[PDB]
Amino acid sequence: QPWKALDAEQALYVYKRCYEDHLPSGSDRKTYMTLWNAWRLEPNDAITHCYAKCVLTGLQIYDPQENAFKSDRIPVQYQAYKTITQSKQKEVTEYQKALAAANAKSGSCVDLYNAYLPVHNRFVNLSRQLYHGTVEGAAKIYAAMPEIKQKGESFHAYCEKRAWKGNKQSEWKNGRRYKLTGSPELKDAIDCIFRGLRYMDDTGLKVDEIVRDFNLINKSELEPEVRSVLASCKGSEAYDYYVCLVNSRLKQHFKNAFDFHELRSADYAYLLRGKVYENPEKVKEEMKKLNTTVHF
């Protein structure tokens, strides 16, 4: 239960979710995107302050419960990958010192941005090495970590391979299905998928993430129904919730939402490319493109 370092998939998840939730859309996007993609924490405004708090929280450099910067995680993040990044121990120590000096104050977006900015300006490139913030550096981690979910591979596919590893044939051998067989392998696959989609963690179900997936297939008016189905669900395991959703009158919409998130979990950039949901047939087409030489 010491804090554990984040691998490439975990960092890439944070970066794409913080773009989704903070990057402006439309005509003002290009200025923010060009600065943030270059790891420049500019301009100094509320949009950027909340983005910075999102990235610091996701990388677990800021802990909201303690309301503190966790400078002791910097050397832990470095130790886990140091044979791949080859980052310099002396610089890692300096980054640790600098972050230990910062004051989170109230923990508000602007307090975190103001405390972190001088540290960022000094250690930005090292931080991109440590937290898999470059495409080439993260690619080395994925090469070294064939066991984590790869770019282009959906969590539903990754979890299926792990769940039916044995002598039992996969239930999804001619394609993933919504059949509720109650098998140990299915319960295992569903837990792994719900955790990869951030529907669940050790603290329990995150209803707002399932609702988010309904919003993303243009069904936001069903939010109350989603909440109601999950609130009356008995059992606490991922498979229990999946069962309630699949048996409910939301079945087809949930299938569409979970299928779109399959696509989105294989290509973490999907919504940032400007792509949106269209219909189930288009999701299938886009999934087929992932299994081609160029992957799109």
Numbering used by the authors: 2 to 297
Task: Please give the exact wording used by the authors of the publication that reports this structure.
The highly expressed D7 protein family of mosquito saliva has previously been shown to act as an anti-inflammatory mediator by binding host biogenic amines and cysteinyl leukotrienes (CysLTs). In this study we demonstrate that AnSt-D7L1, a two-domain member of this group from Anopheles stephensi, retains the CysLT binding function seen in the homolog AeD7 from Aedes aegypti but has lost the ability to bind biogenic amines. Unlike any previously characterized members of the D7 family, AnSt-D7L1 has acquired the important function of binding thromboxane A2 (TXA2) and its analogs with high affinity. The crystal structure of AnSt-D7L1 contains two OBP-like domains and has a structure similar to AeD7.
The ligand-free form of the protein crystallized in the space group P212121 with one protein molecule in the asymmetric unit. The structure revealed two OBP domains with the N-terminal domain containing three disulfide bonds and the C-terminal domain containing two. In its overall structure, the protein is similar to AeD7 with an RMS deviation of 1.82 Å over 239 Cα positions. In AnSt-D7L1 the C-terminal domain also contains seven α-helices and is less similar in overall structure to AeD7 than is the N-terminal domain. In AnSt-D7L1, the second α-helix of AeD7 (B2) is not present. Rather, this region forms a predominantly coil structure extending between Lys 169 and Ser 184 containing a β-turn between residues Trp 173 and Gly 176. Arg 177 in AnSt-D7L1 is equivalent to Arg 176 in AeD7 but is positioned such that its side chain partially occupies the same space as the ligand in the AeD7-norepinephrine complex. Along with other changes, including the presence of tryptophan rather than leucine at position 173 in AnSt-D7L1, this modification acts to further fill the space equivalent to the biogenic amine binding pocket of the AeD7 C-terminal domain. Most notably, a histidine residue (position 189 in AeD7) that forms hydrogen bonds with the phenolic hydroxyl groups of serotonin and norepinephine is mutated to alanine (Ala 190) in AnSt-D7L1. In the absence of ligands, the segment between Leu 291 and the C-terminus (Phe 297) extends away from the surface of the protein and forms a β-turn between Thr 293 and His 296.
